[PDB]
Design an enzyme around this catalytic site. Structure first.
Site, PDB file in Angstrom:
ATOM      1  N   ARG A   1      10.342   7.798 -11.651  1.00  0.00           N
ATOM      2  CA  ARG A   1       9.955   6.553 -11.004  1.00  0.00           C
ATOM      3  C   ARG A   1      10.196   5.343 -11.889  1.00  0.00           C
ATOM      4  O   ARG A   1      10.280   4.223 -11.374  1.00  0.00           O
ATOM      5  N   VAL A   2      10.305   5.532 -13.200  1.00  0.00           N
ATOM      6  CA  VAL A   2      10.780   4.440 -14.040  1.00  0.00           C
ATOM      7  C   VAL A   2      12.261   4.195 -13.794  1.00  0.00           C
ATOM      8  O   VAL A   2      12.700   3.042 -13.733  1.00  0.00           O
TER       9      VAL A   2
END
Ligand SMILES: Nc1ncnc2c1ncn2[C@@H]1O[C@H](COP(=O)(O)OP(=O)(O)OP(=O)(O)O)[C@@H](O)[C@H]1O
Ligand SMILES: [Mg+2]
Lengths: 57, 232, 229, 50, 114, 49, 114, 50, 50
Positions: free
Chosen positions: C77-78
């Protein structure tokens, strides 16, 4: 007989002209491929020597 | 786990429905193909009869009757389905085709391929065997035009380009609804068989020449119908 | 409160603000799923607690995909924020492209014929999958990784046959490292592929591809109505 | 991480949490130990920011 | 590869790949059979069946059950045999030949028997 | 036919030239790869020391 | 239909029907194959794949996932695009043309790019 | 109709009676569709099923 | 025989060896059939299996 021979020549030669153009192309490709294969073998031998010296060290 | 099993049950039920439906429709097409075989038989019988008469009134020097002096190249026409779900049909046909190739090799002739059907075309493409020409899209329901085209191409390859000194047809016969055996037949040059103990327009030799290609087309057509019934 | 156990543990891994020294703690929790069931209780708890997942599937590991990242399930998700600009550019959509390739491969398993676009997608995906294979204890520096992914994403592997792709990468990465290290140095110091560096890399790849050896019975009878010849 | 797949598809940043999840003998410990080993070059810099 | 060697590891990984592909194809094999697979997959499944059966062996402890004495296959012969199997050098032999056979020489013996 | 024979001769000459160039480039490569592997060997030896 | 309008409702229900039929057919396709479907069902499968991939969108907050910036698709444009998809005016474009694309203009741009 | 629906693809090979049954069912299913909050008095239902 | 019969349930034709196997198995299975409450002494069992 001479017209006959001229006919023969034209026919065969135009056949050999096509054959020689194809031979030029094919031989160029084959010799280039042989050179590339030799280069790949030399580089593989270089990497093998590199790995051997790494293992020796 | 239970969710996966429920999904698998649903998928299997759907596949069962589709497979049963295609089983019944395959029974229907078996009936239709066998009916077409029966319908085509009388024409073949009568053309065979008048071909025998012409041969009896012919010198029998046509190219399609005389073996080449030194046959080095032989064509093979492999008849196959154009769609799957037929089990061993294509596998059996191509196994018999490979056995024929081995027999030809032992006889010193390298086979040159003609293929009817998509599945055999893919089979041979996998093994990088060249196919001179291939027809697809009618193995389920062949017409006479397709068989005529195939026979014309084979006859042209025989008369000749490099050409072929001989030609075989490999296809699956329909002996019974329970048995479907793959066979190979030599379609040219046709041997002459003597049976035992008529007017012609314009002459019997030209009629024989015009009829032999027609006979080959008819036999190719009969083979295609037999293959379609066997495939179904 | 097992969730409060794993959360209480993992949520302490954080990137502290500059007012707290700017430190960080990166957590790589490991979870052993029984029978490839990522839908179990503890696996899903830890997935929801974490910022991304790498799902290593035994089927992929046996197929040759080492390490066996199921691209479809895995996610970070980064994402691009945790990559240098070079890899963010050469691999921006790599994960979604590979997931789409896997979906197409599953769908196009039995397709008799495929559109040119679908066939090209399958070939690109297979080459990317081979590119992402990596032997154990063989780390690649970030610059080497961006060059490798550049080979695949930009289509320089399109001509190379699939079975040789793994070698084509390795050999090329050797050649550059041995002859055009300026590309690696530029990527490492500047963290991006400058247009000049990209052109130089393309030229190197195209000249290298020249010298690369890819591994690549019855008879139909006319009845005659007489007794003898 | 030093692994092309992870650094290209599921990048791991400093401060975020990457769950390595899989069945037995899939390569989880291999991935983590490779990640640890790959930090030696950063360590040798002597720079606490790296 | 650092322990068992490059050849052993390569052959093992190729065998595992073939068997994994066979397991993945089981879903279609169960319903439609071998006939409907792609030709590459058809060849893969054939040599996968042969590999699966060659991994079988006639063990000494099995004698009391089968009567046939057990067999020992050294590592080098196993690696060579499975390399040949994966490369397809034995795709012409019947699958029945690889049951409980334990060895290349004894494999040839049973094939001649069949 | 004369032009085709000349084309074949030109193809052979250019093939010889290209093979020589390829061999020279491959020798330079082999040398650079060998140097890189020797440097790697030194690095590994010093790490072990 | 009494709130969003019959035009919106009809397109939504057609999309749902197409996707449900595709979901039902996914069982057959994975095992029997795509060519064994009906012609109507085959065309519906193509439409369904394109509709599934068009329902994807490059979201503004997902720039980190894909890198590319986000998009805002007006409701009327969505209705028109999906009406066309269900009617087949975009059946000739490749599937990837619809992937992560925010509207008809971007769909045309991606199709021309591919 | 629900037993014959698998033959929607190959209706051409169906018997005439089976095709009639399939066509009748494909229309009875539509006949039973009904919009929300639009109940039909019993006589209208009788006529519709007729 | 238990698997050869399943194979032959859909095989178009069988070799002579497969036919012999099938014909022997179809008789061995019938031989092993035995009525209830009718045990056979060991001698009779060995003769029957012979
Ligand atoms: N990328 C890779 N390439 C090749 N082999 C690998 C790779 N990753 C792991 N392996 C090997 O596969 C096996 C996986 O071992 P590993 O300990 O990494 O797995 P794991 O999932 O952590 O297992 P466990 O739960 O038993 O600890 C080991 O043989 C390891 O050497
Ligand atoms: Mg572990």
């Amino acid at each position: 007989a001479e017209r006959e021979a001229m006919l023969a020549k034209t026919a065969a030669d135009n056949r050999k002209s096509a054959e020689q153009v194809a031979a030029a192309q094919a031989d160029y490709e084959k010799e280039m491929a042989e050179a590339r294969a030799q280069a790949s073998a030399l580089r593989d031998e270089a990497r093998a020597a590199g790995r051997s010296v790494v293992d020796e060290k | 786990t239970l969710r996966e099993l429920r999904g698998r049950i649903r998928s299997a039920g759907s596949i069962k429905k589709i497979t049963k439906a295609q089983e019944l429709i395959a029974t229907s097409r078996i009936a239709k193909a066998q009916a077409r075989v029966e319908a085509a038989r009388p024409y073949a019988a009568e053309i065979t009869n008048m071909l025998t008469e012409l041969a009896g009134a012919s010198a029998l020097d046509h190219p399609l009757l005389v073996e080449r002096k030194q046959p080095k190249r032989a064509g093979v026409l492999v008849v196959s389905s154009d769609r799957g779900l037929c089990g061993a049909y294509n596998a059996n046909v191509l196994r018999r085709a490979e056995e024929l190739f081995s027999l030809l090799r032992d006889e010193g002739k390298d086979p040159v391929l003609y293929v009817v059907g998509r599945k055999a075309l893919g089979y041979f493409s996998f093994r990088q065997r060249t196919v001179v020409e291939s027809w697809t899209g009618f193995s389920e329901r062949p017409t006479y035009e397709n068989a005529r085209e195939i026979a014309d191409t084979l006859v042209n390859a025989f008369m000749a380009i490099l050409g072929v000194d001989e030609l075989h047809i490999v296809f699956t016969e329909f002996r019974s609804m329970l048995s479907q055996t793959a066979v190979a037949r030599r379609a040219a040059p046709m041997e002459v068989e003597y049976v035992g103990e008529y007017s012609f327009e314009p002459d019997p030799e030209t009629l024989f020449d015009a009829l032999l290609p027609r006979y080959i087309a008819t036999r190719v057509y009969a083979a295609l119908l037999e293959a379609a019934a066997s495939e179904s | 409160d097992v969730f409060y156990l794993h959360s209480r543990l993992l949520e302490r891994c954080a990137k502290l603000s500059d007012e707290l020294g700017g430190g960080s703690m990166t957590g790589l929790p490991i979870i052993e799923t029984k029978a490839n069931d990522i839908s179990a209780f503890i696996p899903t708890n830890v997935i929801s607690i974490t910022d991304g997942q790498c799902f290593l599937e035994s089927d992929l590991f046996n197929q040759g995909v080492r390490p066996a990242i199921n691209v479809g399930v895995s996610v970070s998700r980064v994402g691009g924020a945790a990559q240098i600009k070079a890899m963010k550019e050469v691999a921006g959509s790599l994960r979604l492209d590979l997931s789409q390739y896997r979906e197409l491969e599953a769908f196009a398993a039995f397709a008799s014929d495929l559109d040119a676009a679908s066939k090209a997608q399958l070939d690109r995906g297979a080459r990317l999958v081979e590119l992402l294979k990596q032997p154990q204890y063989s780390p690649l520096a970030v610059e080497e990784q961006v060059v490798a992914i550049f080979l695949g994403t930009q289509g320089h592997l399109d001509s190379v046959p699939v079975e040789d792709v793994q070698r084509f990468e390795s050999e090329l990465l050797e050649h550059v490292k041995a002859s055009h290290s300026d590309i690696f140095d530029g990527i490492r110091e500047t963290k991006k592929l400058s247009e000049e560096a990209e052109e130089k890399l393309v030229s190197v790849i195209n000249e290298f591809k020249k010298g690369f050896q890819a591994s690549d019975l019855e008879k139909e009878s006319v009845k005659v109505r007489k007794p003898a010849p | 991480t030093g692994i092309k797949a992870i650094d290209a598809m599921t990048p791991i940043g400093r401060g975020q949490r990457q769950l390595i999840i899989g069945d037995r003998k899939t390569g989880k410990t291999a991935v983590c130990v490779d990640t640890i080993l790959n930090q030696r070059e950063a360590w040798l810099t002597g720079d606490p920011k790296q | 590869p650092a322990i068992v060697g490059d050849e052993h590891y390569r052959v093992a990984q190729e065998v595992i790949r073939i068997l994994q592909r066979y397991k993945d194809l089981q879903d279609i094999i169960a319903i439609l059979g071998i006939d409907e697979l792609s030709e590459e997959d058809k060849q893969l499944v054939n040599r996968a069946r042969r590999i699966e059966r060659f991994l079988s062996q006639n063990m000494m402890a099995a004698e009391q059950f089968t009567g046939q004495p057990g067999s020992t296959v050294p590592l080098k012969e196993t690696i060579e045999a499975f390399d040949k199997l994966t490369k397809g050098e034995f795709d012409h032999l019947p699958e029945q030949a690889f049951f409980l056979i334990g060895g290349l020489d004894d494999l040839a013996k049973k094939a001649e028997s069949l | 036919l004369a032009d085709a024979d000349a084309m074949h001769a030109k193809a052979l000459a250019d093939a010889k030239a290209e093979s020589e160039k390829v061999t020279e480039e491959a020798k330079q490569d082999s040398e650079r790869i060998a140097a890189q592997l020797s440097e790697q060997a030194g690095s590994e030896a010093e790490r072990i020391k």
